[PDB]
């Protein structure tokens, strides 16, 4: 790896600088380098890893959707050759590579070394997320296996989070948010999506009274995202 010669602490420092500069590809490469040092990640470091790759793949997903839309309309229309498909495939391949890179870090060896609920649920949610992004562009022999890999990762994260975390825990809340979107957008299960979002929201609401002002603000922010989706879906 090109980051093999840089100190772990320097990689983390530069990841934070890249975030300030909105240089998310750099941020991701720095955090990949930090993971490959082989030590477990702190809570702050896990969030840096997640922020970096979320922004990178977020840009690719947005680009893929633009190009897929153009491609779909070309198939309704004058023939303009292979270029739209070719370029959509280029972006798609780059997106799949980023997802594969993240899943590779989780499998070698973040998940197996993660024993606390807060780290294990975090990494399993990430595994579900990046299989979900693969599922968004999948159209082949393994779309179903990709979907089941996302579901399986989310399900394991859910089981742990329900046993080990309070209903207002932001990681638990963000996991349930994303699993409900998986149900609605990927798994063709809108009723499951709605049920999970409601139940998650209501159980968090009943636990808010236990929280500090600052934790209350953290939890209600994510609860509002559940509410926004319920309003869109119903």
């Amino acid at each position: 790896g090109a980051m093999g010669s840089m100190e772990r602490a320097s990689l983390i420092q530069k990841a934070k600088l890249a975030e300030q500069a909105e240089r998310y590809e750099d941020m991701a490469a720095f955090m990949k380098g930090a993971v490959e040092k082989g030590e477990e990640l702190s809570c702050e470091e896990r969030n840096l890893l997640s922020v970096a790759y979320k922004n990178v793949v977020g840009g690719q997903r947005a680009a893929w959707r633009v190009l897929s839309s153009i491609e779909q309309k070309s198939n309704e229309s004058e023939e303009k050759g292979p270029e739209v498909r070719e370029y959509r495939e280029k972006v798609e391949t780059e997106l799949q590579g980023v997802c594969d890179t993240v899943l590779g870090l989780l499998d070698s060896h973040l998940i197996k070394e993660a024993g606390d609920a807060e780290s294990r649920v975090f990494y399993l949610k990430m595994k579900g997320d990046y299989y979900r992004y693969l599922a968004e562009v999948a159209t082949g022999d393994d779309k179903k296996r990709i979907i089941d890999s996302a579901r399986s990762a989310y399900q394991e994260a859910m089981d742990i989070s329900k046993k080990e975390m309070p209903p207002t825990n932001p990681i638990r809340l963000g996991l349930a948010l994303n699993f409900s979107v998986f149900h609605y957008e990927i798994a063709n299960s809108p009723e499951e999506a709605i049920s999970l979002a409601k139940t998650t929201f209501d159980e968090a609401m009943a636990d808010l009274h236990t929280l500090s002002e600052d934790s209350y603000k953290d939890s209600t922010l994510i609860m509002q995202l559940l509410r926004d989706n319920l309003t869109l879906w119903t």
Binding site: D129, G174, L177, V181, Y184, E185, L225, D228, N229, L232
Partner: peptide, 6 residues
Amino acid sequence: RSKTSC
């Protein structure tokens, strides 16, 4: 679009 975690 459905919202996912920030």
